[PDB]
Amino acid sequence: RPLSELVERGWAAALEPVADQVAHMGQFLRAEIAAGRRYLPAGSNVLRAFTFPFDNVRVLIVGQDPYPTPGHAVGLSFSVAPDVRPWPRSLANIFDEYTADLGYPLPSNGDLTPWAQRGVLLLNRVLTVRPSNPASHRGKGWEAVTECAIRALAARAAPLVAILWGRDASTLKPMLAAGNCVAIESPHPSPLSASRGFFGSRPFSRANELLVGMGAEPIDWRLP
Ligand SMILES: O=c1[nH]cc(F)c(=O)[nH]1
Ligand SMILES: [Cl-]
Structure with missing residues (x-):
């Protein structure tokens, strides 16, 4: 199938x-x-x-x-359907950092679609996984697709901030070495890594200050 049947046209290109x-x-x-x-x-x-x-x-x-x-x-990445409770722990943790950083109330649900509609790409290094088996599709071919996606974002040389959560950060920073591109990293928000540097990282307000610094408009992070 042509990609234009699976993805948005700019992405297909x-x-x-x-x-x-x-x-x-x-x-x-x-x-x-x-x-x-x-x-x-x-x-x-x-x-x-x-x-x-x-x-x-x-x-x-x-x-x-x-x-x-x-x-x-x-x-x-990280999102769930609006009816899903409890939220997964990675998402709960992102939302505590969201309230600590921004002072917003907790979100009503775990659907991050509004971020996606506002110019936040919620990507994962690897786009599929086998149920109950974390990281089980590592090394299976998605890395070449996500490396292409990231480099192609950076090559637009429009203002871009990458928030890099977890162990792929040092691999992904060289892919973001370009004009008007900034990459900011932390430990991942999952159960056992979040309390080791995720919390306290203030990625939402940081992204917005870096954008404004480049002359771009900040993201409206506010969820319903
Ligand atoms: O690294 C991730 N952990 C949990 C997720 F839901 C996800 O999308 N990515
Ligand atoms: Cl999780």
Whole structure:
């Protein structure tokens, strides 16, 4: 399938260099199914982040891999469906840092769609995972697709802030070495890493000051 049938047109243009890789991933996933091994998130949500316009991304959030628990991952990193409770612990932790940093009330739910609609790309280094098996699709081919996405964001040389959460940070910073691109890192917000540097990192207000510094408009982070 042409990418323009799976992603927004600007993204289809940016990722055409890895279009065969994206097809190989779809082959890989269908092969996993044929072998009885499922993947998350849903096939139609795998490239969901690439359904919001390439040309409008001003903040790039990059995590590691999707939620491994069925019913959580939705193709926007860290987000959940609006009816989901309890929130996953990574999301709960992001929302405590959100209230500490911004002084906003806790969000009504865990649906981060409003961030995606406002120019925040919620990306993961690896876009699929096997249920109950964290990080189980590492090394399987998504890295070349997400490296293409990131470099192509940086090559626009429009103002861009990347928020890098967790262990891929030192790999991803060289990909963001370009004019009008700034990368800020912390430990990941998951249970056992968040209290080791995620909390206290103030990535929301920092991103907005870096944007304004470049002459860009800040993000309205406020969730309902
Ligand atoms: O690194 C991640 N952890 C948890 C997530 F939900 C996600 O999308 N990415
Ligand atoms: Cl989690």
